[PDB]
């Protein structure tokens, strides 16, 4: 596979619960639920956020942490890809320009991640995505130049397997 162990699965106590997270987005089959803890209600606060997952049936709780030596990157936007994987946007943890980045397919159990949309341009950031069947609508924020004073948005529909 063209995947890398980007995330570390860390089990959590039954008493534990997020205190500064985005709203819980349920899985399509309503078996699981996920959110980003550590960056506020809309993940706009600075810092390295953690993806919090909940097995609604078994009442289990765990977190997916970005395996990194320095606290530079963070999950910025998450949504469901299927019943076992998430769509995760990984952006810089600090700064005012870092609204988006690269879109990945992340396994909620193994933390194994594969790219879905990488623009290979730091002036072109994936900010979020919406999936409907085999198609994903990817929003990209394009900055015109290195001054980062002028931007525009794009919608790109990608086909998946």
């Amino acid at each position: 596979d063209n995947s890398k162990k980007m995330f570390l699965k860390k089990e959590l106590g039954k008493n534990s619960k997020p205190t500064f997270a985005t709203k819980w987005k349920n899985s399509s089959n309503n078996k699981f639920s996920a959110c980003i803890e550590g960056k506020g209600e809309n993940a706009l606060e600075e810092g390295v956020g953690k993806i919090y997952i909940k097995n609604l049936k078994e009442q289990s709780k765990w977190e997916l942490d970005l395996d990194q030596d320095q606290q530079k990157n963070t999950p910025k936007y998450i949504d469901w890809f299927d019943d076992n994987n998430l769509m995760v946007v990984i952006s810089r943890a600090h700064g005012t320009v870092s609204q988006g980045g690269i879109l990945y397919k992340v396994n909620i159990e193994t933390g194994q991640a594969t790219e879905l949309y990488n623009t290979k341009d730091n002036k072109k950031q994936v900010v979020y995505a919406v999936k409907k069947g085999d198609k994903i609508d990817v929003q990209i924020l394009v900055y015109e130049d290195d001054d980062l004073l002028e931007s525009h948005e794009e919608t790109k529909t990608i086909t998946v397997k």
Side-chain angles (χ1 to χ4, degrees), residues 3-14 16-56 58-160:
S3 60
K4 284 166 186 192
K5 219 251 195 280
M6 274 195 92
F7 291 87
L8 305 169
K9 184 193 175 194
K10 296 171 181 291
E11 281 167 11
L12 292 160
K14 239 171 167 67
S16 81
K17 266 155 197 161
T19 69
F20 196 54
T22 69
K23 284 180 179 79
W24 285 109
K25 265 168 190 143
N26 256 52
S27 176
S28 83
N29 64 351
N30 290 308
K31 189 192 190 108
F32 297 112
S33 201
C35 73
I36 302 149
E37 165 66 353
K39 290 178 128 285
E41 211 189 67
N42 293 283
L44 294 163
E45 296 300 301
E46 273 196 3
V48 171
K50 310 145 138 201
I51 305 160
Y52 263 41
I53 300 132
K54 224 161 58 181
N55 186 317
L56 294 166
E58 302 246 306
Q59 263 293 278
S60 310
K61 300 156 192 205
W62 70 94
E63 75 182 57
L64 292 180
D65 281 3
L66 213 50
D67 187 355
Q68 45 170 13
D69 315 290
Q70 293 185 316
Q71 295 271 99
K72 70 144 86 194
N73 284 311
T74 185
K76 183 61 132 212
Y77 179 91
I78 72 152
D79 214 339
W80 292 94
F81 179 90
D82 60 28
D83 301 301
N84 302 297
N85 307 271
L86 288 161
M87 281 182 313
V88 185
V89 174
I90 285 150
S91 69
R92 285 281 199 275
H94 306 97
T96 50
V97 153
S98 56
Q99 308 183 18
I102 305 155
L103 186 74
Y104 297 93
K105 183 177 103 125
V106 180
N107 194 306
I108 68 149
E109 187 50 59
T110 63
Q112 215 72 7
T114 82
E115 296 182 358
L116 280 172
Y117 204 104
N118 176 354
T119 72
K120 298 266 172 177
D121 190 344
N122 56 1
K123 271 188 287 291
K124 276 136 166 285
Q125 301 176 6
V126 175
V127 290
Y128 63 91
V130 198
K131 188 170 173 279
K132 185 74 189 166
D134 58 310
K135 309 266 165 78
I136 309 167
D137 275 5
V138 177
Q139 283 276 129
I140 305 143
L141 170 81
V142 193
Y143 285 109
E144 298 315 312
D145 60 17
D146 282 349
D147 282 356
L148 306 170
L149 295 185
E150 179 178 6
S151 84
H152 78 261
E153 287 196 14
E154 294 181 342
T155 316
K156 306 299 234 221
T157 297
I158 56 167
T159 306
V160 294

